[PDB]
Amino acid sequence: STIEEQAKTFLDKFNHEAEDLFYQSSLASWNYNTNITEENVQNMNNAGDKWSAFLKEQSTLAQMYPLQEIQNLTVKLQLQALQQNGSSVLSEDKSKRLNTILNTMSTIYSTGKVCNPDNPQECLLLEPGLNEIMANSLDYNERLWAWESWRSEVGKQLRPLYEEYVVLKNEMARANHYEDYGDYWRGDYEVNGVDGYDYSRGQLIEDVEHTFEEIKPLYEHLHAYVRAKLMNAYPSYISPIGCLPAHLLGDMWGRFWTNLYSLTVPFGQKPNIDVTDAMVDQAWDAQRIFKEAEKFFVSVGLPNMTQGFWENSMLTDPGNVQKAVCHPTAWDLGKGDFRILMCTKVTMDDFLTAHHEMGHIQYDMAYAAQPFLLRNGANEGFHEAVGEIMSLSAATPKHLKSIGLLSPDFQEDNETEINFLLKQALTIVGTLPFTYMLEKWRWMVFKGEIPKDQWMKKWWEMKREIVGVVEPVPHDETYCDPASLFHVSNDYSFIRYYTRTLYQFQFQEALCQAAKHEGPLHKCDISNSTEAGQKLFNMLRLGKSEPWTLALENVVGAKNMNVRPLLNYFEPLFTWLKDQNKNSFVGWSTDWSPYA
Amino acid sequence: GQTGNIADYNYKLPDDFTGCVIAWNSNKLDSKPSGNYNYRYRLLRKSKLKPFERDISTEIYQAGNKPCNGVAGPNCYSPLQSYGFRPTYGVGHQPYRV
Ligand SMILES: *[C@@H]1O[C@H](CO)[C@@H](O)[C@H](O)[C@H]1NC(C)=O
Ligand SMILES: *[C@@H]1O[C@H](CO)[C@@H](O)[C@H](O)[C@H]1NC(C)=O
Ligand SMILES: *[C@@H]1O[C@H](CO)[C@@H](O)[C@H](O)[C@H]1NC(C)=O
Ligand SMILES: *[C@@H]1O[C@H](CO)[C@@H](O)[C@H](O)[C@H]1NC(C)=O
Ligand SMILES: *[C@@H]1O[C@H](CO)[C@@H](O)[C@H](O)[C@H]1NC(C)=O
Ligand SMILES: *[C@@H]1O[C@H](CO)[C@@H](O)[C@H](O)[C@H]1NC(C)=O
Numbered sequence: 001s002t003i004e005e006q007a008k009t010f011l012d013k014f015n016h017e018a019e020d021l022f023y024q025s026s027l028a029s030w031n032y033n034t035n036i037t038e039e040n041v042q043n044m045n046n047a048g049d050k051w052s053a054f055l056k057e058q059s060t061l062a063q064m065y066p067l068q069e070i071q072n073l074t075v076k077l078q079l080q081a082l083q084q085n086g087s088s089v090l091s092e093d094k095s096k097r098l099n100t101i102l103n104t105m106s107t108i109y110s111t112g113k114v115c116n117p118d119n120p121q122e123c124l125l126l127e128p129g130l131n132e133i134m135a136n137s138l139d140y141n142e143r144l145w146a147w148e149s150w151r152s153e154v155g156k157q158l159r160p161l162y163e164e165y166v167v168l169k170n171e172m173a174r175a176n177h178y179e180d181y182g183d184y185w186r187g188d189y190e191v192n193g194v195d196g197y198d199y200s201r202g203q204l205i206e207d208v209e210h211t212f213e214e215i216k217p218l219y220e221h222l223h224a225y226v227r228a229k230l231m232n233a234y235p236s237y238i239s240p241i242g243c244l245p246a247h248l249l250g251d252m253w254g255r256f257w258t259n260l261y262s263l264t265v266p267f268g269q270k271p272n273i274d275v276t277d278a279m280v281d282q283a284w285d286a287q288r289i290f291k292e293a294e295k296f297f298v299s300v301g302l303p304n305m306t307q308g309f310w311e312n313s314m315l316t317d318p319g320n321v322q323k324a325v326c327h328p329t330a331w332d333l334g335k336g337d338f339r340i341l342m343c344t345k346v347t348m349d350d351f352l353t354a355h356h357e358m359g360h361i362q363y364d365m366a367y368a369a370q371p372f373l374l375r376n377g378a379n380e381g382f383h384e385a386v387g388e389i390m391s392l393s394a395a396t397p398k399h400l401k402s403i404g405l406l407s408p409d410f411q412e413d414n415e416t417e418i419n420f421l422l423k424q425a426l427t428i429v430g431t432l433p434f435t436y437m438l439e440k441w442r443w444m445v446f447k448g449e450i451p452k453d454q455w456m457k458k459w460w461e462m463k464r465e466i467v468g469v470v471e472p473v474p475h476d477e478t479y480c481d482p483a484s485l486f487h488v489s490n491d492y493s494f495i496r497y498y499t500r501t502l503y504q505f506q507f508q509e510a511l512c513q514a515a516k517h518e519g520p521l522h523k524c525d526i527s528n529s530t531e532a533g534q535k536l537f538n539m540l541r542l543g544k545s546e547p548w549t550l551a552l553e554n555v556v557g558a559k560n561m562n563v564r565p566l567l568n569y570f571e572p573l574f575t576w577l578k579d580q581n582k583n584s585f586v587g588w589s590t591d592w593s594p595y596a
Numbered sequence: 597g598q599t600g601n602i603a604d605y606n607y608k609l610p611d612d613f614t615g616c617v618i619a620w621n622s623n624k625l626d627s628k629p630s631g632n633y634n635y636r637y638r639l640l641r642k643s644k645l646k647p648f649e650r651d652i653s654t655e656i657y658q659a660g661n662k663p664c665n666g667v668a669g670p671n672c673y674s675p676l677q678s679y680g681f682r683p684t685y686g687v688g689h690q691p692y693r694v
């Protein structure tokens with residue numbers, strides 16, 4: 001007879017119907033991914049259309065209940081999710097042109113190819129050939145050519161489309177209750193109505209700024225070391241005071257520095273820990289890899305896997321006539337159906353990937369009890385953070401020796417630990433300033449702070465001031481450099497990776513303190529610690545029911561994201577960097593540029 | 597003495613019940629890939645059921661303070677909704693014969 005009582009029954013009915021419809025959409029997607037055929041494509045399209053129609057109908061129904069009249073703080077969250085207004089609030093033609101812009105951008109990025117001038121002999125796409133050249137080639141001229149060619153091929157085409165896109169998304173946000181699309185994206189972290197645990201949209205900006213200000217010294221030392229090594233590699237193209245050039249970073253954009261490990265490895269005599277030959281010599285396969293990962297997740301305290309999981313999941317690529325996508329993915333089909341789609345091979349990387357995916361599935365099992373609208377991670381970062389913490393925990397030499405992959409007679413030294421920490425640094429620390437800079441530029445563009453005539457100028461100035469990266473050839477307003485990245489082209493939130501990077505280290509610090517570990521944080525194994533598993537489950541079982549601040553409190557004892565876990569993790573490598581760069585000018589100057 | 601949707605809206609055993617509850621899995625027989633929607637359970641009733649009662653009346657639930665006027669839609673929902681049983685389902689949602 002009241003708003004709350006009416007809303008409860010509607011939410012129950014919607015949850016029950018959505019369970020079945022989402023299950024048939026997810027099963028259609030799984031069938032298509034495992035076995036690609038025209039029938040499967042039709043089935044997936046039909047299931048997706050049905051699910052979208054159901055979501056639209058229920059969203060239009062749910063607007064009747066005002067959110068000022070609901071005082072459960074859970075029905076309020078479910079109704080907010082339903083009333084998020086995924087259906088366009090703008091006009092039909094405006095929605096059509098927005099979809100047109102998105103489709104055109106995605107198609108341009110996916111089908112972008114580069115050939116030789118007036119020469120159709122070779123035409124390289126992005127992933128197959130251009131990424132390979134950027135990752136492996138050591139030719140400065142070739143790298144500059146590839147970088148400039150990709151930018152000229154994609155940004156010139158994508159600039160006006162992205163301008164129309166930012167105008168349209170700002171209009172959409174103003175049509176909704178948000179200010180700009182940056183505000184819309186920042187709303188994922190907004191928590192209101194819970195005094196003592198609230199998070200505001202504006203607080204994310206300040207939190208990220210403070211975290212990066214804390215990270216700055218370690219990144220500066222890493223940049224100095226990488227710059228010194230790249231000066232050793234390319235003699236005169238790098239200035240001892242200048243910023244690192246963009247095309248030499250390792251990948252087409254500079255998101256990850258992992259490709260620089262071979263050139264800038266500190267100690268090459270002692271090889272990094274490899275277990276592929278050992279696994280072959282002990283006759284291991286993917287099924288027993290997943291069995292060992294299941295044993296690890298049991299030992300930490302998480303529940304065992306399902307017989308249905310083992311029967312339905314395809315952990316090996318069928319090959320032959322069958323063709324399937326080989327990108328590893330953990331599927332929560334719903335109603336007890338948990339599956340992994342991974343063309344697993346006998347590699348240490350695949351072992352860690354299997355641990356990552358089983359962490360995903362354990363999280364999915366943990367939040368299974370909560371309603372459908374709440375069956376997710378507390379924010380966009382915890383889910384991959386939980387994957388990554390297990391990935392790091394299962395890669396320790398102690399764990400490898402315990403499982404038996406390594407010879408127990410082995411002992412570890414300083415060089416191996418330093419090399420491993422520097423590799424993980426190039427993987428993890430390097431992507432933080434880039435993510436921060438890209439998200440800040442995108443937020444400013446959405447807010448309209450950066451004018452159209454100064455988009456790229458401000459972009460490169462902020463990159464030079466923050467990431468210490470300068471373009472080889474100066475680019476005027478015609479080019480649109482950020483549109484090259486897949487996330488920017490397809491309009492995906494990108495601060496998720498920054499948040500996940502902080503969250504995984506906070507989780508690791510908390511769980512290592514729980515597991516009664518003595519020593520540096522990198523050599524932390526939580527294999528047989530039952531207390532750590534329960535301490536993590538306290539958050540894993542919640543899902544989205546509670547605010548992410550409360551979940552972070554439950555895990556680490558702090559209501560705000562902290563970077564001290566990252567600093568403590570990289571303390572030994574920071575000491576090594578201080579020792580190495582004692583004679584090198586740490587930092588960079590904006591004046592220097594490759595072009596003169 | 598159990599509280600829950602099925603217990604209070606489908607079949608309520610008495611507090612002092614004297615009998616045997618026998619349950620065994622029926623996924624091998626009663627599960628269809630397309631979805632066996634024959635089996636249904638009730639999820640909206642005006643009040644709790646008295647012990648050992650069977651309610652087969654299916655009329656438009658009046659959740660709203662406006663009259664349903666015999667039709668459904670806004671604040672007026674069907675009392676019954678079916679399980680969709682498929683063999684791929686995991687334990688916890690597979691059909692059990694009791
Ligand atoms: C509404 O509040 C009650 C508190 O008595 C809680 O048990 C219930 O779970 C809440 N509703 C939902 C949908 O969680
Ligand atoms: C969603 O769009 C409908 C369109 O009529 C509007 O009435 C409603 O206020 C919108 N809700 C939000 C939360 O923007
Ligand atoms: C359930 O867990 C136990 C150990 O806790 C394990 O021995 C068993 O194989 C698991 N069940 C399945 C079906 O994997
Ligand atoms: C894919 O599914 C169809 C229909 O279920 C089946 O006939 C076929 O053998 C499967 N595999 C391939 C490679 O088509
Ligand atoms: C510790 O690491 C340093 C690296 O500078 C190395 O010189 C030293 O020999 C290492 N200590 C031992 C005991 O190997
Ligand atoms: C963890 O427990 C397993 C099972 O008892 C045992 O084999 C293994 O040695 C333990 N880990 C360590 C580091 O001792």
Ligand SMILES: [Zn+2]
Pocket residue numbers: 356360383384385387388
């Ligand atoms: Zn993950």
